[PDB]
Symmetry: C3
Subunit: 150 residues, 3 copies
């Protein structure tokens, strides 16, 4: 009797594994990218930094925060697909010249374009990632592709 | 006799498989609802991102296995309001007083258990407003069903 | 034992709760850009692309271009095409042997819904297939841009 119930439960779990795997592919197409235990997903539209940041936070995640070459390449895929530069979560709003994650932690990885960050006009505290994957500091008031990470 | 050992192993394996599914699915729920969904309690609102007349909007939700947004509490209404605000487009609710003027009901025929009418509403303006729209401020207003509003379904 | 059945019953409760949550999130997932039919799921990207680019998007996503293999699957796909009011590309081509359409695997068609007079290989250069809002098929040049719909 027990073995019968266990084998039934085994069947339910096996079905869920197959169904879940199929569903993951469906969900990620065409606005998501999975890399490691992280998932990037674009909203498909642009917003100023503050608005983009709130959208990600309210959704239970945060703005894209690539921490390795692998994560950056994954994010770049979405930027390329939408052909629109996107905002990252990091800023040097607290201390000019020092970029940090929303927590306050210093960067553990960076992929700055040549000469960046340059605080152009003395007012660039946010970061955007181009279609080539390189980063550039940009005015937080500009509108860029919204991409969150979960 | 000691066959319980093999069954034991199977159970221990299942526990690990279930924990994996739970963790993985917890993450995908958040991913899935961004940026067009909103969960509240055990209900989920999902917008199509475009506008349609009531009849068309109703059919879209029903064919999808759900129904038009039907907030049953202040909390559900506020959750729906978040989507409407984000899209900046008033949306249709599921209720109408098409059967009996002045009496709004859900698609099932049940009378409303919650409402958030703007002052003076419903007013059946022009004697032809049997559908309901929710504004970006969360308030309700009866509106002509032929008008086009944001499509938001609940699942 | 007893301590095992209690464990199984508790675990099964969790699994059935998971089955319920999953079912709900699946319906949410498919609205409004997807459609399920049998064990297959169609999902549109919501934009148009030339065949090669569309085929790459689906492959990279772990699926392939829409490949209706029955009247039921074709009707399901038709719903998305109608909803978007944009004809979409199917996965099949007759690039290897003109006049003989096959799936990406090389297998011959097991179902077709060609519009009257098709496939005609117009201009002697139509090796891809599009499905209209009326559900009928027509061979079209692969370089044209059509709605991207993948199947999983
Ligand atoms: Ca500064
Ligand atoms: Ca700066
Ligand atoms: Ca700069
Ligand atoms: Ca009336
Ligand atoms: Ca009325
Ligand atoms: Ca009114
Ligand atoms: Ca040819
Ligand atoms: Ca041909
Ligand atoms: Ca033709």
């Amino acid at each position: 009797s027990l073995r019968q119930q266990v084998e039934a439960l085994q069947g339910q779990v096996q079905h869920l594994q197959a169904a879940f795997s199929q569903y993951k592919k469906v969900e990620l197409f065409p606005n998501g990218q999975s890399v490691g235990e992280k998932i990037f997903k674009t909203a498909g539209f642009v917003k100023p930094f503050t608005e983009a940041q709130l959208l990600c936070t309210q959704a239970g995640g945060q703005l894209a925060s690539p921490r390795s070459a692998a994560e950056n390449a994954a994010l770049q895929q979405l930027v390329v697909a939408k052909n629109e530069a996107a905002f990252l979560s990091m800023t040097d709003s607290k201390t000019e010249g020092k970029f940090t994650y929303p927590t306050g932690e210093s960067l553990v990885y960076s992929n700055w374009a040549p000469g960046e960050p340059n605080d152009d006009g003395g007012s660039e505290d946010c970061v955007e990632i181009f279609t080539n994957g390189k980063w550039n500091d940009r005015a937080c008031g500009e509108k860029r592709l919204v991409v969150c990470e979960f």
